[model samples]
Target: SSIKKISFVGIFSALATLVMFLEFPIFPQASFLKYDPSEIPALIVSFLLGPGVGMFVVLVKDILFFLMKSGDPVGIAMNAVLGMSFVGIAGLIYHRNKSRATAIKGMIVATLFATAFALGLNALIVPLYFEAPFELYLKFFPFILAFNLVKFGIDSVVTFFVYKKV
Candidate 1:
């Protein structure tokens, strides 16, 4: 059962990661912002396999993707940890409730948490890591917020429809 769970988690993580890689620009308000809706798969993992498996799949996929596809080590590291944490928080909440309305609340809370984490990371953590604080760090807030909000909203909607049917 555990192996089946792992397999499903792995497959879904790959699916999520693939969605992430195919991202398109957000445009208008936040130029560099992109939305991939990968959290849909991550949420599915939480719903189907459980939160631990969901988190594991998220972390593992981020690590593998960073090693193989990343252009910036620092950015990759930042995203891998932060991204997994962000999604895990939300998914866990949704899993705890096991209901559509609560899942929506969970997604909102998760997105908010993710934005808060990025805000803190930019203000404090990033400064500590870089030899010289890059101006690019300033852009973290908008991108993080935009990306997470859209992702969460879409994920929740998809999860709601599919879960209702299930």
Candidate 2:
């Protein structure tokens, strides 16, 4: 089981890392900033395995991304937290029952939890890292909230539909 599970995780992490590179700034809040769908693979892995394993994939993907490209520490840190909470909570919910109902429940709960967490984290990161005004964070609050919903919201939908296929 360990060998098989490790290989499964290895495969998903590779996909996650590669998917991390592909993102679009579709959010109205920030044109220059973008979002990626790497969470799909990581969540799939987590749902099949466990929350900790899912987090493992998320970290490995981020670490690999860092190793390959020296980018913003803030970006990495945000991704790390966002990815972990989403998959961690979702995994805990789904693995407990391993049913369609639990899967639905987990995804919804994780989406709200991750969205709320990201919004607050974004507010903090912007004020501190970008040295933006507190007013700016407020101005962007709705966009940030909606963006996280769309980001992880569609992520939940896709994972729900696609995980069955995998």
Candidate 3:
């Protein structure tokens, strides 16, 4: 059963990896912020398979993405930490309550966490990692927040509807 879960997670992870590369840059406001809705599939699978399965999808995607992408080593590590942290946090929240309404709430909370973490990350962590100044990474929180709200909203709605169908 665990193997089945792992296998399913592995499939979702591959899908996530495919989706990640198709990211459109969200820069000038959030340079390192790339938007890719591919996480939706993995998120949905996680809900069905269990939170552990979902986390597995995120982690495997991140790691495999790095192995294939040839990124700046530090940036890759940072993405893995931040990216998975976003999904992991959201998965836990959703897994706890696991209602349709709670799924939306979970996505909202995850989006907020992602936005806040992205800002804080760019402000503090990115600078440290890159040996640059925090000011170099400044982003307009309003735009980031708004964009993320829509993005997460899309994620929530998509997950909800798909969860019902699939």
Q: Which 10-residue window in model 1 sums to the lowest lDDT?
A: 27-36
Model 2: runs farther than 4 Å from truth? none
- RMSD of candidate 1 to the true fold? 3.3
Where model 1 places Cα greater than 4 Å from the true spot, the runs are: 27-33, 125-144
Expressed as tens digits, the lDDT of each residue in 36-146 for candidate 2 is 999999888888789999999999899998888686677787888888999999999999678989998999999999999988887778787668888887877787788
> Backbone clashes in each candidate structure, one number apiece?
0, 0, 0
Query: Clashes in model 2: which pairs?
Result: none
C-alpha positional error of residue 98 in candidate 3 after TM-score superposition, expressed in Å? 3.3
List the pairs of residues colliding in candidate 3. Answer: none
Query: What lDDT score is found at residue 49 in candidate 1?
Result: 67
CA lDDT of each prediction against the hidden true structure: 0.67, 0.85, 0.68
Task: Kindly list the per-residue Cα lDDT of model 1 for residues 1-166, writing each as its tens digit.
Answer: 8787767777888887777787666665544445666667777777666767667776776677676776756655666566677667766777755776767777778777766776676666645655447565575556756666666567667777887786
Candidates in order, TM-scores: namely 0.75, 0.93, 0.78
* Candidate 2, poorest ten consecutive residues by summed lDDT: 25-34
RMSD of each: 3.3, 1.5, 2.8
In model 1, pairs of residues that clash are none
